Design an enzyme around this catalytic site. Structure first.
Site, PDB file in Angstrom:
ATOM      1  N   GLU A   1       0.902  -1.077  -0.160  1.00  0.00           N
ATOM      2  CA  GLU A   1       0.119   0.214   0.567  1.00  0.00           C
ATOM      3  C   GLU A   1       1.087   0.877  -0.015  1.00  0.00           C
ATOM      4  OE1 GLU A   1      -3.178   2.226   2.541  1.00  0.00           O
ATOM      5  OE2 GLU A   1      -3.858   0.124   1.115  1.00  0.00           O
TER       6      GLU A   1
ATOM      7  N   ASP B   1      -5.250  10.390   8.541  1.00  0.00           N
ATOM      8  CA  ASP B   1      -4.143   9.809   9.709  1.00  0.00           C
ATOM      9  C   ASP B   1      -3.939  10.338  10.052  1.00  0.00           C
ATOM     10  OD1 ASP B   1      -3.625   7.677   7.067  1.00  0.00           O
ATOM     11  OD2 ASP B   1      -4.135   9.311   5.658  1.00  0.00           O
TER      12      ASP B   1
END
Ligand SMILES: OC[C@H]1O[C@@](CO)(O[C@H]2O[C@H](CO)[C@@H](O)[C@H](O)[C@H]2O)[C@@H](O)[C@@H]1O
Ligand SMILES: OC[C@H]1O[C@@](CO)(O[C@H]2O[C@H](CO)[C@@H](O)[C@H](O)[C@H]2O)[C@@H](O)[C@@H]1O
Ligand SMILES: OC[C@H]1O[C@@](CO)(O[C@H]2O[C@H](CO)[C@@H](O)[C@H](O)[C@H]2O)[C@@H](O)[C@@H]1O
Ligand SMILES: OC[C@H]1O[C@@](CO)(O[C@H]2O[C@H](CO)[C@@H](O)[C@H](O)[C@H]2O)[C@@H](O)[C@@H]1O
Lengths: 391, 245, 391, 245
Positions: free
Chosen positions: D43, D54
């Site tokens: 990823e 995030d």
């Protein structure tokens, strides 16, 4: 009571007799001139923000175990304190009498800022005398007055303090009074200034009378206001004075308490004397020399008090008490945390007196405190105290 | 009676000192020095904590005297120390109202007995109404002290009457040219000596003032000199250079 | 125009979809509930000081050679800026939806103070996330928020800045939204926040419409407001938007000018992009990375702008321009000296645009500038600039 | 087609890296190290200036990559450098919407040609109305990239339809116990592998997650390790200790 003089008067050197007599004669005509009253009304509404609200403070009341509590919000006035009511009135008076110039003196700068603010809006030359030692201590307010267009005269003569600025300002007025008005900040001074200042602050209680009747249908039971020189309290009291069912409480700066001698509580330990042209209660020693004062709040830190409060103290019409620095500090934090209203340390003395009597008042009673100003200006000093949480 | 005597001589010099500036002994020494220097009338300042009507030099002088613990009692010591030197020179007590308002009638008698002859109260004007009386000016007259009053060109006729009621000894005058005639009309109205209140500090202006005034006052120069060199000999010397002739 | 999305939207990670959908559904009911609207009205009047005055500033107008000039005085609102209109609305909304807690993030602290102020008055737990680097830079506002009873969480994770506080605040809301409302400070954010904030600031132009008709009998010719995220301007514009004879001017922070790259003028050089959950004009590079911004005024120093202004920029309904730091600084001093009104540096950008167009306007025109806040908070920074006198 | 192939094997490990953190060469080296360490799917994060979704560790990683001048062009270099090593391992581009919204359809084709197989856009949810289409998800399908979508327990049935419309490859799942059955209903509804999106950083939890999930993702551990000791050997080693068996 045994008095050689009525409270007030005009105990002036010769060179001020003509200026003071002219003002008095001019003022008697002006205070009933409808065009002057109308224009001052318009300015107070569209420029200063009158009328100020009356705020019920239910969280504060609950936190102090008090009854129904309302705050007259002079903190929401332009410049953040009631002093502008009087600055605009007197500077408008100057303009109407044909003066082009206004002269004042200032210690901390609060009165200098209000006068300078009114002079900028009205287009008058403004001159503020300030002792050099105060200039150094108050560079933020000095810069503000200069940005407002005032000339700030740093007095380096004598001992460079308030006393020396007062002398310089009065000397200026004696020379320039034919075109200069002298703007006094509080309900002190020789006649006719106590009447003039009271007249321009009475709008506070005229508004309160309408507002408290609108929410409660009756006059309050108690009015509480702090007392520096007396101007916000006398205007806040004025239209309720003839109602004997309204108690009137004035709260002075108690500093470190009466026993320490470090306070500003004229009515606790002072007695009548002649000072700065008028006769009233005064913190003075056996020889009549004026005593040094102390208060956490510089707006209360005076040895003098206005003669209208002296009359009501001896007549028994109003109760004059005090709050110590630390009671004022605690009330400050209580109001800030419970209502999000940051009060001036001056008004925090009024709040403090309510905090200490609140549990004894029956819950149906209505108490109005006069929130004479906001306390943003006091935050740097309070933050330096490094207090913990109050309850 | 003692002021009236001294003005039989013409063109007098009044000298100001702050009582207690430098202490009791020093004040007495300075007064002796001014008398030996030719000063005809001493104007003795009762220092006040808030003398807003005096210039900064005198303000700081008052501060010094009160920090050296001048009281209403040591002022009597000072006056008695002067009178133990000279019992002819008139003494004017110059004061703000409050230090005398806080005393009583008996203190006024004690002042007179100590040697004071006149009292000048700079912030107590004569009453404005022709009827209204002045408790303190009455008190001065009752004990034989001369109330020393101040008049201006713009003195309202209402004052003129009541000022004439209480004025004794001489009148101070605070003028604005043909000032000579200006003083004569005042002098003839009151039939008292009229003294120009302006601060004189050099011989040239003192001689100028005496053309029309019955005396001149040295208000600042002596006090200022005690801050340059406090040795009182220099006060005698300063008087001698300022007083004409 | 070529756009894949309408301006606005909700570009959100999954964990915020349910909270945002609940709010939207709840808000649609609440904005027409008369009891909620009535109570918010009462609070804005008796606590915040609405309605704020409309001040004609004839000296300022004369000094800039301008026409008839009025200031909508949001500086006289409690806390000194328009932000409280939205803080009180959203925190009252929280209370009505059953939330006991309100969470926000703040950079300079202006929004943190308004939210904390509303939460104290309404009795809600208030939590403000702030990057540790901002905590260190804003100790006065941190102390104020704590005195107002807010919990100020110093975010020491990541790079200790606004970006990290935003992440912490949204993470909190995703966990606590069943009892916590998330209070957004400007007309930014995912739907429905641009509608919510606009709804609570529209009171400004509803008042102006009444006040300008009272003094002049007609709508203004020009409305000028500064643009940080867009909330004071959209509320000031709102009720005049349907009148095509009223020009609408929004003034962004021009910093050191466009050529220097140090500015916050989204509409000068930015273009549409998706950022913080919504699509609008954005200062971004070729790759779509958000650019660093600069403005003398921290309230304008943002790379984003509200989607309702993006719509009006592309529709041609409103003119979006800028003022440099130095034009804003000059207008600041001009208003202070001529009217005694100390404007925020944010609003000084609106004032500056008027200063530069004033001589070309015909004298009969009516210009209203929105004085979004007072500038006492800007005095320490302005005093440090050590400017001389402006004309 | 390449993601679907890899999930024929069971219990896969997804490893996250920020493209450009440490530079182009380093990113390629780190990717090699993770592949040799057993990671089945990379990823690859397109760093964004404002990655509010995030955790702070990844936020600071994005800051580093952009200060080292990661661009939409060097990202292609990075993907091509990985594919010059291994052309079997699926590559997921993980990104915020705006860096892709600011590119065009041709850039999507260039990504596919470079080696990218799926695109996960963390702040672009599937459209809410059953009718409303998504220009970007359509664009992904048009060029053969798999849109990697995220679902929650509270996913409204309106999403379920449109999420099923655009989802390809596998679905990330963000759960709240009997979570095993919870995943089966989702898996049978979509007939795609369902991967628990939670951050795994030790072998014990990865084995736990694989009881019900078709894979686990190591989101933080690899990035954090590049800040402890950036020598990529330690990334291979870290993978080997985290992946069960
Ligand atoms: O010490 C000031 C003194 O001077 C006078 C005029 O003689 O006023 C002048 O000085 C003021 C202080 O700066 C100025 O504001 C004024 O404009 C100037 O005329 C007196 O009024 C004053 O006592
Ligand atoms: O000098 C004594 C004199 O001062 C007054 C105030 O006018 O009180 C002051 O002195 C007292 C004795 O120390 C203190 O208790 C008091 O706090 C202080 O203000 C008079 O009461 C007294 O006569
Ligand atoms: O980092 C805060 C984090 O913890 C949560 C609960 O898991 O909230 C807690 O911490 C907050 C910050 O101090 C407190 O205000 C709150 O009362 C406490 O529950 C999350 O909401 C948040 O993301
Ligand atoms: O990175 C260039 C990109 O940035 C924008 C803003 O979105 O403009 C910036 O860069 C320009 C070139 O230096 C500056 O003139 C401008 O002031 C700055 O904000 C775009 O215009 C451009 O595509």
């Amino acid at each position: 009571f045994k008095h050689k003089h009525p409270f007030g008067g005009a105990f002036l050197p010769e060179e001020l007799l003509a200026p003071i007599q002219n003002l008095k004669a001019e003022w008697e005509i002006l205070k009933t001139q409808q065009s002057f009253l109308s224009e001052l009304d318009c300015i107070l509404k569209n420029y200063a923000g009158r009328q100020t609200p009356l705020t019920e403070v239910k969280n504060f009341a609950r936190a102090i175990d008090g009854p129904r509590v309302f705050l007259k919000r002079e903190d929401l006035l332009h410049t953040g304190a009631h002093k502008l009511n009087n600055a605009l009135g007197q500077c408008l008076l100057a303009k109407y009498l044909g003066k082009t110039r206004v002269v004042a003196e200032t210690g901390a700068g609060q009165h200098g800022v209000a006068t300078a603010t009114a002079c900028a809006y009205l287009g008058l030359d403004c001159v503020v005398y300030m002792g050099a030692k105060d200039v150094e201590r108050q560079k933020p307010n000095v810069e503000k007055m200069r940005f407002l267009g005032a000339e700030v005269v740093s007095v380096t003569k004598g001992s460079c303090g308030l006393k020396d600025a007062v002398n310089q300002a009065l000397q200026d007025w004696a020379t320039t009074h034919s075109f200069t008005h002298y703007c006094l900040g509080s309900a002190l001074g020789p006649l006719p200034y106590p009447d003039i200042v009271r007249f321009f602050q009475s709008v506070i209680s005229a508004e309160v009378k309408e507002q408290i009747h609108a929410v409660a249908g009756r006059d309050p039971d108690i009015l509480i206001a702090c007392i520096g020189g007396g101007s916000n309290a006398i205007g806040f009291f004025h239209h309720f004075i003839p109602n004997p069912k309204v108690q009137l409480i004035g709260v002075e700066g108690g500093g470190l308490g009466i026993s320490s001698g470090k306070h500003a509580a004229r009515f606790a330990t002072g007695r009548p004397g002649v000072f700065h042209g008028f006769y009233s209660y005064l913190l003075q020693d056996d020889d009549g020399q004026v005593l040094q004062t102390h208060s956490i709040s510089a707006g209360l830190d005076y040895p003098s008090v206005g003669p209208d409060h002296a009359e009501m103290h001896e007549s028994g019409r109003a109760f004059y008490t005090l709050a110590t620095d630390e009671e004022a500090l605690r009330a400050f934090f209580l109001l800030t945390r419970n209502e999000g209203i940051i009060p001036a340390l001056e008004s925090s003395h009024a709040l403090a007196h309510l905090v200490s009597i609140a549990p004894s008042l029956p819950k149906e009673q209505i108490v109005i405190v006069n929130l004479s100003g906001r306390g943003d200006k006091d935050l740097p000093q309070i933050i330096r105290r490094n207090r913990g949480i109050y309850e | 009676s003692k002021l009236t005597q001294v003005f039989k001589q013409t063109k007098l010099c009044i000298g100001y000192l702050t009582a207690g500036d430098g202490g009791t002994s020093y004040t007495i020494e300075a007064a002796k020095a001014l008398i030996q220097g030719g000063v005809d009338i001493l104007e003795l300042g009762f220092p006040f904590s808030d003398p807003v009507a005096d210039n900064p030099e005198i303000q700081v002088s008052h501060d010094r005297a009160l920090a050296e613990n001048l009281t209403s009692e040591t002022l009597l010591e000072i006056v008695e120390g002067i009178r133990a030197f000279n019992q002819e020179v008139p003494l004017i007590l110059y004061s703000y109202y409050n230090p005398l308002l806080q005393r009583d009638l008996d203190y006024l008698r004690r002042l007179k007995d100590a040697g004071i002859n006149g009292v000048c109260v700079i912030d107590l004007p004569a009453p404005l109404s022709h009827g209204e009386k002045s408790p303190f000016f009455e008190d001065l007259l009752a004990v034989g002290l001369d109330p020393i009053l101040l008049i201006s060109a713009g003195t309202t006729p209402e004052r003129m009457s009541l000022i004439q009621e209480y004025a004794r000894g001489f009148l101070y005058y605070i003028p604005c040219v043909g000032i000579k005639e200006e003083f004569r009309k005042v002098r003839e109205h009151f039939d008292l000596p009229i003294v120009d209140r302006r601060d004189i500090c050099d011989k040239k202006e003192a001689a100028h003032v005496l053309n029309y005034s019955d005396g001149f006052i040295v208000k600042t120069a002596f006090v200022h000199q005690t801050t340059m060199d406090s040795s009182v000999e220099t006060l005698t010397a300063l008087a001698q250079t300022v007083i004409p002739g």
